[PDB]
Amino acid sequence: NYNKAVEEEDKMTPEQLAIKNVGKQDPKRHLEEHVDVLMTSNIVQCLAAMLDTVVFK
Amino acid sequence: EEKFIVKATNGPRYVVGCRRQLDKSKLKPGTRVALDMTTLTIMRYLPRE
Amino acid sequence: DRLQFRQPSLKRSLMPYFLLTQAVRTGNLAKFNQVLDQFGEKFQADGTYTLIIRLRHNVIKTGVRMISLSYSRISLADIAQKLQLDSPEDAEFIVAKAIRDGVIEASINHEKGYVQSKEMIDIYSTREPQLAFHQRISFCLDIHNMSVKAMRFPPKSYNKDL
Amino acid sequence: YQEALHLGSQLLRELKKMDDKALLVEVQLLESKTYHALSNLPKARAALTSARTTANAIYCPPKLQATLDMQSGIIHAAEEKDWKTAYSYFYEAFEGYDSIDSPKAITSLKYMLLCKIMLNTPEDVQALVSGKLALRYAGRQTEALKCVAQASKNRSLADFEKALTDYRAELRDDPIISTHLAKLYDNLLEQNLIRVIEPFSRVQIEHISSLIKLSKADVERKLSQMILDKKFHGILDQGEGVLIIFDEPPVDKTYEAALETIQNMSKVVDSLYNKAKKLT
Amino acid sequence: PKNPDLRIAQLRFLLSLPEHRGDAAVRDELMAAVRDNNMAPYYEALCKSLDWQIDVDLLNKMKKANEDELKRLDEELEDAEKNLGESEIRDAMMAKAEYLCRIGDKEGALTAFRKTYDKTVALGHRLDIVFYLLRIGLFYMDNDLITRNTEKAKSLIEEGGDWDRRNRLKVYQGLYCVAIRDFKQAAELFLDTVSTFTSYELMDYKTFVTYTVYVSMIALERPDLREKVIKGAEILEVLHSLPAVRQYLFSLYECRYSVFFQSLAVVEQEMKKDWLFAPHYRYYVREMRIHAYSQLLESYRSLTLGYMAEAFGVGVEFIDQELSRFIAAGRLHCKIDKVNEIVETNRPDSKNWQYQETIKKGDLLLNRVQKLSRVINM
Amino acid sequence: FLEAVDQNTAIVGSTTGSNYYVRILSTIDRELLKPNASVALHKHSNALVDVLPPIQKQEVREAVELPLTHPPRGVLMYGPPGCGKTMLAKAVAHHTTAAFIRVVGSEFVQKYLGEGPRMVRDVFRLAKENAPAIIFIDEIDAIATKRFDAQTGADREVQRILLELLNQMDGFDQNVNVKVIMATNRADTLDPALLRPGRLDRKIEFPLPDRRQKRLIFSTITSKMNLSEEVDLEDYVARPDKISGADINSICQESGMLAVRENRYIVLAKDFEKAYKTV
Amino acid sequence: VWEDNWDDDNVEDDFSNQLRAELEKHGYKMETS
Amino acid sequence: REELQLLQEQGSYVGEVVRAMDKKKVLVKVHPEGKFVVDVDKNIDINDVTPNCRVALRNDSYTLHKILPLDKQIKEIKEVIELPVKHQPKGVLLYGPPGTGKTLLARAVAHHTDCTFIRVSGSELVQKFIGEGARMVRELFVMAREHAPSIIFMDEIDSIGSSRLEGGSGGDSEVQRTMLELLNQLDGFEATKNIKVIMATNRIDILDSALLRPGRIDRKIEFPPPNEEARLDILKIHSRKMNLTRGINLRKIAELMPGASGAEVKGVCTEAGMYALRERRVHVTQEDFEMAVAKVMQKD
């Protein structure tokens, strides 16, 4: 829901990025937050092998 | 529901947390409560009169 | 067929070949065999009639391919009589040749003379899913992973000069 | 009813300015009657509001005043918003039609027992058919209402079909409220169907259709219609009669994922437009 | 144009192809040819008409009346020119363009509507000129010329949607959206039918309802009908005009094919022989049959041939090839069962396929990011 | 927060009233730089993390609920004899399910002349952004009094605010999601700038103590109820010319409250003169 | 939209040889089949 | 993290310097119980810190950081307004019913001329933004010199309330004297063109303006409510707003609106749109305007 809440503005980003291309006005990076979301999402991948070990032996 | 805003009698306002002993019964707004000088914890409430 | 092109040249050029080029899909042997030579002048008079004399024997292969995209199991009367081929030998033979391909599965049965079939072609949903799309997960993560390399290396090729 | 409503409306456009506005109550009343005949609730509420703002200062004899309250109760009873207010309009309408006409009185109390039987309370129906006041206006019309109230208090279905079968020769001239009567029949039918099918996950169609001793044609069509309406989880069967109930709880996953894919496709396409623009 | 010559000259489709109904169309076409300067249209379409015995009789009078009215409009245009005024010259050139639309010549009307298109004092008059090009664009059945002026004149309104101007543009949207096979976006256009009125310019109200009852009856599902049209009083008021529409609506919503197939021949015959609705008659038939098969087959898992044959009232040998062609070609449900001569499907399209609906965007997106890899270094 | 002097640095007013000069943190973007916002620093670090969030019924009905969903706004009423202003405000407040901002006409007359535009700007911004709020401004005669002297400059300032919203409704003439209904008891003291056409397009008028509508309301009030040959209206219309009174229909309702005792079937002049001498 | 012309041309062209309409024939096939 | 000690500094105050001392010890006015006089830091000069301004002062070091802060009427008005534009009159007035034509004409012709519109607007927020104190007539001419194209018009004083002739003679004579000395400047000398003024009065003060202007420098364009063409043109103004068809005749419908004033036409249009939407049409027709004429003339 937060990812879509950022993508709704990321749909408007290519207009300004397609008009000015000079200077940055928004202090938000919109990248490291999504990287952190991926870090919180990698828990399923890291614990999938854990469930594989608990089920295996 | 865990952290709310308090209003001190002196005039400056602050914000406190929730203590593990108390529950959400007396935590509802509209009831005068008490605070501590250290960590601004909540010991008990204060019934108005 | 002609979908995105609107010009009054390919229409008139395709009129004699239209009825047969649509008649290939249904694949009728006896009728269309006479329909071709009935009014066929140019497309069969093009020379040596090689590709059309191979098409006359390719009608059954395009038809059995339409059966491959159609239902898998073959009946003894309904679809065998529908395809103008009542022969349980080459039917089970060609169907077996479609089973050994690996893209589909089928079976054969004989109780009172007719060929029965359970025709269970249910998809892998709730039927060994991990073994089903396991290679899909591994392959998709490998291609998307080398795509992650393909989005990590160009930044290096960007900061290489500065 | 089209040219009469249009010609009558255009007549109102030139008659609202004319003096003696009391005559407009008849054509606006008939306007509401034909708007209900055409099944148009909003315009019947606008023209009905015009009849209220017209009859607020005009005080014509109650021959037209009670019909405004009765037709108002019919309009409110068409959408089934609130039965209390509509029951009040039929009550005042019955007070207006009191001791002035026998058919208008028996249809006034018939409308009272109708709008009051729609809310599933037969005790007041017995209280109105047991009193000496409304007893003198009883007849063949109120007998069918007593059969509907008896079938409602008894929670029976074949008895209600018997009331719709034997009394169809006084139910043949029934007004447009016949759709509401079919809505009550389908309501009790829905109650019984969700009553006996709900505990039976997979059961025979004749073992569950025997108690109701009715055919599977109308019941099967209504059931299939209700599954097509997607009000509950279930599916019918004809060859084997197997009943299967299932659900898919994780709905918010494929929707958000599909929205992320569709929204990101525009991102990648826009990226290809920026690169395709900057390169060639 | 907005005159009845658009419809009278629009009946040339049923005047040309069928030879049975080519009597009334030439009756009111030849009788109405003395109206709205119909010389050039029927003279161009004279190949689909009678001989030249009576044809050359009125041509000598129409060719001189056209020159008389043309030179009178030129004299009025010269009298309105070289004078202080904007609406007078716009009414002179606009009236000349209207007469040039009556004769059916889009050259002098093209340059005329171009001049008065450049003399537009406001954007509303410009959109009125656009509509003046659409009323003839319906007869000329052009594709891009009717979408260019509406695509350019669509934006920058700033005056709000009027009662019949914006609604009229919505009617045009119904026209070009019924011509094209776009339905999912055309199902919302006819929602403003409450503000519509009898417009003799393009299409009558009964013809607009008769034309939208197909896209609404077929292009919508049961919840869409119950929310849009069944809840609305529009069809409840207009159903009394023709009792057949009520039968085709209560029969389809009631799932009674016994009367639907017996009365469907009226929909088949009436569906064709139309100006803009005939060339697409094959899509409504197949789409409606697969829509009804998905409707009845949705709430039914297994179906025997007895209840199906008695319900539809047709032989089994026809529905056999019907389902045989609509399972592979139509792709409506999973594999069919025929071990006991009973149609029995499973349809596992919710649990796993609901998550598998994104694999198409995953594969196409995979090829798209492979193209993204192709953009790298080149 | 009080003011922002430059980028990445601003001033902040403490609760005790003293202004503090503290450099903001780089993580917080420019969105939290709102001048009138509820900023919260730390008790020791004094750094901000996040801000805290702060014919009458027919003409009224067709003039209010029809332009709301489908359009002139304003249903200004008149008539000092009748009370009014409640059955229609509550009638619209119960028929239509939307927001309703009922405020006394003197709601922006305070000691701070700058607080006016903030209050009416907040009410107007929640009326344009929250929901289609139907603002009920009653008794504008108190704020419609012009003045030129400087001793009472607060009234001239709040009537300059009345002109400010008088221009903001000109900006809200077309394509706005708000309805401005108005009620008053005296139209003689109202300036012509408020009653200008194009702003309040509805002049809804109620009946009056005038003898024409009194005779018409007597005829229409005796048409419904039962009458007799003894009931005469000549003396009962000449006597009110000697002794004048208001709300005669309420007096007839009192006569119904004196003849409703189920003692006499047909009301006569006994309860009429009795109602005239008692009430 | 040329995407739908593949199916519309598939069934439309497929029925161009025989049984093009077939809707008028069902009324005669009800009593015979 | 190096700034974390400046966060531990318990913030800083906001100093306001009011008087600088020559001994390099400038006193700063601070919050009550403050008034801490101290020398500024060494890296900041003293002469740059001007008094009577707010600055940034720390709570412990007491060091300063930096300083802190109508075709019948446009056919006649084209030769008046449009003469110095595309083709001099000192002023023009239009007296009559204050329905329409007093502001929409000035802003319409001023909008087609692509020139700005400047009002008098005698109130606050204009005597301070434009100059501090003066005769209130020359600064507007300086702004009219920086912006040469401009249309001046009296709109706030145009009201029927000035009909006492006792206090309204002086109170109205303030703006009448304002335009007297303004016409004395325009009649005296001009640095740029496109400088004009337009009068507006609805009552006897028009004849008082005729006593103050004995036919010397003025343009007379009268708008009488009994005249017919004065209803054709203003009816066209009433037709440019809402939708109107092209097959309508304005002659008789413009002649059948007699009586009180020209605002009766505004009553016909505003009371006619409810019958246009009530009839479910897109535009108002002549029969609708006739029924509205009846609806507004039956009350008289």
Three-class HEC string of C1-60: CCCCCCCCCHHHHHHHHHHHHHHHHHCCCHHHHHHHHHHCCCCCCCCCCHHHHHHCCCHH
Distance CA E28, CA D178 (A): 47
The reply to whether residue E346 touches residue C70, judged by beta carbons under 8 angstroms, is no
Distance CA E237, CA D40 (A): 7
The reply to whether residue H14 touches residue F5, judged by beta carbons under 8 angstroms, is no
SS3 H113: coil
- φ/ψ of C133, rounded to 5, equals -105, 20
Nearest to E350 by CA among E304, E301, E314, E306: E301
Q: Would you give the end-to-end CA distance of chain B in angstroms?
A: 26
Q: Closest Cα of chain F to A6: distance in Å?
A: 16
In 3-state terms chain A splits into helix, strand, coil percentages (rounded to 5) of 65, 0, 35
Resolution (A): 8.8
Token code pair at residue H28: 């700063």
**Pairing outcome for strands F134-138 and F100-104:** parallel
Using the Cβ of H4 and the Cβ atoms of chain F, whether some distance falls under 8 Å is answered with yes
H275 neighbors H138 (Cβ within 8 angstroms): no
Q: Closest Cα of chain E to D19: distance in Å?
A: 30
C67 neighbors C61 (Cβ within 8 angstroms): no
Q: Would you give the end-to-end CA distance of chain A in angstroms?
A: 37
Query: How far is Cα of residue E118 from the mean position of the Cα atoms in its chain?
Result: 30
Distance CA E57, CA D130 (A): 89
Distance CA H97, CA E165 (A): 34
Phi/psi class of residue B3: alpha, beta or left (left: φ > 0; alpha: ψ in -120 to 50)? beta
In 3-state terms chain G splits into helix, strand, coil percentages (rounded to 5) of 60, 0, 40
Chains touching chain B, criterion 3+ CB pairs below 8 Å: F
Nearest to D87 by CA among D102, D104, D108: D108
Token code pair at residue E268: 């088949």
Distance CA C42, CA C36 (A): 11
H56 neighbors H65 (Cβ within 8 angstroms): yes
Q: Which residues have C-beta within 8 Å of that of residue E304, sequence separation ≥ 6?
A: D238, D239, E341, E342, E343
Nearest to H49 by CA among H69, H34, H61, H64: H64
Location of structure tokens 């009323």: E135
Chain F interface, mutation test: which of D53, D68, D81, D99, most F Cβ atoms within 10 Å?
D53
Distance CA E299, CA E336 (A): 16
Binding-site members of H are 96-103
Q: Would you give the end-to-end CA distance of chain F in angstroms?
A: 63
Distance CA E94, CA E90 (A): 6
Q: Closest Cα of chain C to G30: distance in Å?
A: 22
The reply to whether residue G30 touches residue E313, judged by beta carbons under 8 angstroms, is yes
Residue D164 burial (CB count, 10 A): 19
Using the Cβ of E258 and the Cβ atoms of chain G, whether some distance falls under 8 Å is answered with no
Q: Closest Cα of chain G to C141: distance in Å?
A: 32
SS3 C158: helix
F164 neighbors F117 (Cβ within 8 angstroms): yes
**Pairing outcome for strands F10-13 and F19-22:** antiparallel
Q: Which residues have C-beta within 8 Å of that of residue C92, sequence separation ≥ 6?
A: C74, C108, C115
Pure H helices in D167-209: 178-196, 205-209
**Pairing outcome for strands H12-13 and H53-58:** antiparallel
- φ/ψ of F22, rounded to 5, equals -130, 130
Using the Cβ of E317 and the Cβ atoms of chain G, whether some distance falls under 8 Å is answered with yes
Phi/psi class of residue H62: alpha, beta or left (left: φ > 0; alpha: ψ in -120 to 50)? left
Distance CA E5, CA E19 (A): 22
Nearest to E343 by CA among E296, E303, E285, E287: E303
Residue E40 burial (CB count, 10 A): 15
Any idea what DSSP says for residue H284?
Answer: B
Using the Cβ of A28 and the Cβ atoms of chain F, whether some distance falls under 8 Å is answered with yes
Distance CA H144, CA H155 (A): 18
Token code pair at residue F265: 């079937």
Q: Closest Cα of chain D to E147: distance in Å?
A: 25
E-assigned strands of chain H?
12-13, 16-19, 27-29, 53-58, 64-68, 91-93, 116-119, 150-153, 195-199, 219-220
Touching chains A and D? (3+ Cβ pairs < 8 A): yes
Q: Is F153 annotated to bind ligand? A: no
What Rg, from alpha-carbon coordinates, does chain H have?
30
In 3-state terms chain H splits into helix, strand, coil percentages (rounded to 5) of 35, 15, 50
Token code pair at residue D146: 């007593």
The reply to whether residue F11 touches residue H68, judged by beta carbons under 8 angstroms, is yes
What Rg, from alpha-carbon coordinates, does chain G have?
13
CA atoms within 13 A on the CB side of G3: 3
Q: Is F85 annotated to bind ligand? A: yes
Distance CA E217, CA E271 (A): 13
Query: How far is Cα of residue E312 from the mean position of the Cα atoms in its chain?
Result: 30
Distance CA F208, CA F79 (A): 8
Any idea what DSSP says for residue E328?
Answer: I
Distance CA H279, CA H272 (A): 10
Distance CA C40, CA C55 (A): 14
The reply to whether residue D13 touches residue H279, judged by beta carbons under 8 angstroms, is yes
SS3 B16: strand
Q: Which of E84, E91, E163 sits opposite H282 (nearest CB)?
A: E163
Please, which residues bridge with residue F138 across strands?
A: F104, F183
Q: Greatest CA separation found in chain A?
A: 59
Residue H11 burial (CB count, 10 A): 24
Chain E interface, mutation test: which of G25, G26, G31, most E Cβ atoms within 10 Å?
G26
Run of H or E including E342: strand E342-344
Any idea what DSSP says for residue H43?
Answer: T
Chains touching chain G, criterion 3+ CB pairs below 8 Å: C, E
Distance CA F136, CA G20 (A): 68
Token code pair at residue D45: 């509420």
What residues in F contact B12, CB-CB < 8 Å?
15-16
Using the Cβ of D127 and the Cβ atoms of chain E, whether some distance falls under 8 Å is answered with no
Q: Which residues have C-beta within 8 Å of that of residue C45, sequence separation ≥ 6?
A: none
Length of chain E: 378
Distance CA F111, CA H283 (A): 50
Distance CA E233, CA D191 (A): 29
Distance CA F49, CA F22 (A): 13
D74 neighbors D33 (Cβ within 8 angstroms): no
Nearest to E93 by CA among E264, H135, H184, E101: E101
Distance CA B27, CA B2 (A): 9
Q: Which residues have C-beta within 8 Å of that of residue E110, sequence separation ≥ 6?
A: none
Any idea what DSSP says for residue F51?
Answer: P
Q: Which residues have C-beta within 8 Å of that of residue C21, sequence separation ≥ 6?
A: C1, C14
Run of H or E including F222: helix F211-224
Taking the CA atoms of F231, F234, F238 and F240 in sequence, report the sign of the dihedral they define. positive
Q: What angle do CA E181, E185, E191 make, to 5 degrees?
A: 115
Experimental method: cryo-EM
SS3 F136: strand
Determine the angle formed by the axes of helices D41-54 and F56-69, rounding to 10 degrees.
150
**Pairing outcome for strands H16-19 and H53-58:** antiparallel
What residues in F contact H159, CB-CB < 8 Å?
192
